[PDB]
């Protein structure tokens, strides 16, 4: 489950649910009520990974980041995931930032220095390339993904429930 | 860990780093200083899998090959030296030249050939029998050759390869 | 002509050539041997504008930036060529680069050194263009690495514009 | 900066800010708190130019009209970006024309609309209000987000404040 890397060892809240097959490596911080599902890998060796509270990383997904060059003309984001975020099955989340309540559709890929605003839906099977800034409260999908439109209030209320229901799921385990 | 398939046991160099959750099955050969990362599956039952020196197979990736027929020729999976296969890739019965980079989430199908010093963009699909030249950038689904690589990108593939080796040493 | 904005006065090297019709406003710094051509506008009021050494801003172009309260100032390297009627907006341009006439470079874009942007190109916000390439189109795409003749042309283009400006006043 | 053409003199509100290098010619009407930035050209000789209040015409832009048959009518709190070509079109309140864009005759840009930089809006094109429209030739992409609408509400009002910091 946990593995140290250099001097780093994962800082995982007591209420975080961690399923079987998961591997969390190195500089990884995970907050309260977050749930990490089967065979997910969170490899915080190149750069850190921070995951807020109430966030779900679903099965077979991978979180990582590109190698840091310690140059100043090269912005190089770590992996920062907010609260009540849903990261779908088999996603690849790579050195990007994801705002609160957002939903990354299963099988999507998010590359380094991209930013997903809060309350945003990434369609399944999408690809968000490096340095793409996705605003809050939109639907964004495709390969490479396009901003389609602002979300409806019904879709926003859905985001308000998605990650909380996954928390409820993890407690019955 | 490692699993027997018929008469075949994996041949793995003693400096190969094999992370936890990995399954390596059957006719699989892995060379010096290579790194197989967490939950990768290397299933050499249908055909063989040969991985050179200093190569990285990243997390949650799958290596396999299609069933060989008694025909039409089936390619095994052959991966050169200092190659990087990205997270959650599917590498299926193809050949990959030295120093190339398979962007995370890509799918490379049977009898395809990736030239050396080539970059496959993340999320690409390289279809059956497609032949990618060396020293190019290739991406999309289905993937197409975009352009030649710059000297900086080529130097990146060189300098990157070694860095992936030091990373495993700290484990 | 030079104009003050709040507390800011342009800081212009004594060897900089500034052509007639030019307006330079506020927080703008221009290095030695640079040449600013007819009717160009360098408005450093939302954010600062920095231009290095031996750089040419050609005729009728505009340099500006977006309001700040992350947002990038305008930073132009040494021996850079900004072609006629270009719009240079809150971006970073590395040494010896050539911005094709009529191009538009938006905020937080970065142009690597020794690169050519083709005429009439559009480089949108947050795009990172590597060094030593040809990049063109609207929106622009990286096309290929530059040949050695093109890198040589870049070594000389800005310097020719220096000598050119010396023949004026 | 102000020029006569035949019977027509520019009617420019007193609070309008006009930068150096500007030339305003003929039948041009500019409303209160508008600001016209360096080296812009507003040529009302083939036809009239009407500009509402709080509108900014940015640097090195050009306003004109084809030979007469729509004139150039720009609403309130509009932003016309640097080096634009605005030609015999109508632009509604609060809209933003991205720098380097070209708007041709009888085109109409709805209110609270964003035209992306470097776009080309061809003759007789009607662009709806509250959309993002961009490209050459331009396409309507989508409706603007609330955050983009809020940005438009503040865009020209901040430009008015920008101009006060200058010498009039």
């Amino acid at each position: 489950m946990e593995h140290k890397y250099k001097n780093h060892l994962p800082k995982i809240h007591e209420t975080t649910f961690v399923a079987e097959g998961v591997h969390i490596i190195g500089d990884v911080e995970i907050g309260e009520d977050s749930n990490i599902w089967f065979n997910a890998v969170l490899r915080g060796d190149e750069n850190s990974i921070k995951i807020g509270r109430g966030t779900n990383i679903q099965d077979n997904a991978t979180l990582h980041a590109s190698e840091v060059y310690h140059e100043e003309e090269i912005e190089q984001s770590p992996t920062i995931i907010g609260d009540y975020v849903t990261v779908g099955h088999n996603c690849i989340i790579h050195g990007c930032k994801i705002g609160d309540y957002s939903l990354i559709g299963m099988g999507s890929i998010i590359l380094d220095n991209a930013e997903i605003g809060e309350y945003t839906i990434i369609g399944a099977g999408s690809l968000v390339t490096q340095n793409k800034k996705i605003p809050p409260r939109v639907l964004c999908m495709g390969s490479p993904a396009k901003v389609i439109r602002e979300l409806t209030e019904e879709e926003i209320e859905y985001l308000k429930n998605s990650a909380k229901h996954n928390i409820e799921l993890s407690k019955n385990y | 860990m490692e699993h027997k398939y018929k008469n075949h046991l994996p041949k793995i160099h003693e400096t190969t780093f094999v992370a936890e959750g990995v399954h390596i099955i059957g006719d699989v050969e892995i060379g010096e200083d290579s790194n197989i990362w967490f939950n990768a599956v290397l299933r050499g039952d249908e055909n063989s899998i040969k991985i050179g020196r200093g190569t990285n197979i990243q997390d949650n990736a799958t290596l396999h090959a299609s069933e060989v027929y008694h025909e039409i020729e089936q390619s095994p999976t052959i991966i050169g030296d200092y190659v990087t296969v990205g997270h959650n890739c599917i590498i299926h019965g193809c050949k990959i030249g030295d120093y190339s980079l398979i962007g995370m989430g890509s799918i490379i199908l049977d009898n395809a050939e990736i030239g050396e010093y080539t970059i496959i963009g993340a999320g690409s699909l390289v279809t059956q029998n497609k032949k990618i030249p060396p020293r190019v950038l290739c991406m999309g689904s289905p993937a197409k050759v975009i352009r030649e690589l710059t000297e900086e990108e080529i130097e990146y593939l060189k300098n990157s390869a070694k860095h992936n080796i030091e990373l495993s040493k700290n484990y | 002509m030079e104009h003050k904005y709040k507390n800011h006065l342009p800081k212009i090297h004594e060897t900089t050539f500034v052509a007639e019709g030019v307006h330079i406003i506020g927080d703008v710094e221009i290095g030695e041997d640079s040449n600013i051509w007819f009717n160009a506008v360098l408005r450093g009021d939302e954010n600062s504008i920095k231009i290095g050494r031996g750089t040419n801003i050609q005729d009728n172009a505009t340099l500006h930036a977006s309001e700040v309260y992350e947002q990038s100032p305008t930073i132009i390297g040494d021996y850079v060529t900004v072609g006629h009627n270009c719009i240079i907006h809150g971006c970073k341009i590395g040494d010896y680069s050539l911005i094709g006439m009529g191009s538009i470079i938006l905020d937080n874009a970065e142009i690597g050194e020794y690169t050519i942007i083709g005429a009439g190109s559009l480089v949108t916000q947050n795009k990172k263009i590597p060094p030593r390439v040809l990049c063109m189109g609207s929106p622009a795409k990286v096309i290929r690495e530059l040949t050695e003749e093109e890198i040589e042309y870049l070594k000389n283009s800005a310097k020719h514009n220096i000598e050119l400006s010396k023949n004026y006043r | 900066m102000e020029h006569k053409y035949k019977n027509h003199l520019p009617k420019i509100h007193e609070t309008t800010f006009v930068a150096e290098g500007v030339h305003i010619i003929g039948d041009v009407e500019i409303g209160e708190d508008s600001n016209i930035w360096f080296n812009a050209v507003l040529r009302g000789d083939e036809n009239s130019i009407k500009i509402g209040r709080g509108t900014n015409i940015q640097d090195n832009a050009t306003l004109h009209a084809s030979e007469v048959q729509s004139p150039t009518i720009i609403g309130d709190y509009v932003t016309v970006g640097h080096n634009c070509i605005i030609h015999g079109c109508k632009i509604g309140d609060y809209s933003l024309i991205g720098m380097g864009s070209i708007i041709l005759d009888n085109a109409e840009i709805g209110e609270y609309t964003i035209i992306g930089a470097g776009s080309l809006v061809t003759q007789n094109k009607k662009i709806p209000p509250r959309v993002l429209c961009m490209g050459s030739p331009a396409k309507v992409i989508r409706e603007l987000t609330e955050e983009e609408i809020e940005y438009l509400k503040n865009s020209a009002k901040h430009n008015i404040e920008l101009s006060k910091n200058y010498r009039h």
Binding site: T129, Q130, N131, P144, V147 | - | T124, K127, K128, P139, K141 | -
Partner: peptide, 8 residues
């Protein structure tokens, strides 16, 4: 816009 695929 987006269109371009800068890098990777």
């Amino acid at each position: 816009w987006v269109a371009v695929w800068g890098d990777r």
